[PDB]
Every structure is written in C-alpha cells, then in structure tokens.
Amino acid sequence: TLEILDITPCSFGGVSVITPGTNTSNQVAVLYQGVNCTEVPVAIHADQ
C-alpha cells in the first residue's frame, strides 16, 4: 500500500558511563552524546 513512513534509527551504540569507582560505590550516571532527553527512550529502545 502506498504509504510514506519515517524510519527513526533505534541503535545508539555510543554510551558514556560516569563511575566514582566500583570500590567507592556502585551508583553510576549515564551520558548520551549529542541527543535530546526526549529521544533517549526511542534511541536505545528502552521498551525492549
């Protein structure tokens, strides 16, 4: 059926993780490079 659909990529292989040292603590903070905070669920397909 003739239907134009947009293809938003859902494969973001670049993730930077901030850790204070496993010895110090387990808590970690994640940084995504050059992405909005709304497209993060779509980019990494957090549903799956």
Partner: protein, 48 residues
C-alpha cells in the same frame, strides 16, 4: 599565532564498518580487539 589543540573525534567501530547488520557484527567480534585498540587510541588523543 600558535595552535594549542585539535578537534576531538570519537568513532564507534562496530557502527562504522558494520552498519545496520547484526550478522556483520557477528563476524566483527570474530576479528578480535582490533576495534577496541582504535577506540582506545583516539581516547588518549581526546583527553590530551
């Protein structure tokens, strides 16, 4: 006039050579840590 720094560049080896192909990634990890070495080398340049 004296240059002081370059432009930091980071590359995802899996995404660069194996685009949107999981089967390609299945063959890339067979090659070994060749991709990791290139990524680590650019990290030293970036932090420098």
């Amino acid at each position: 006039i004296l240059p002081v720094s370059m432009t930091k560049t980071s590359v995802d080896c899996t995404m660069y050579i194996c685009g949107d192909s999981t089967e390609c990634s299945n063959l890339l990890l067979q090659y070994g840590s060749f991709c990791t070495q290139l990524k680590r080398a650019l990290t030293g340049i970036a932090v420098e």
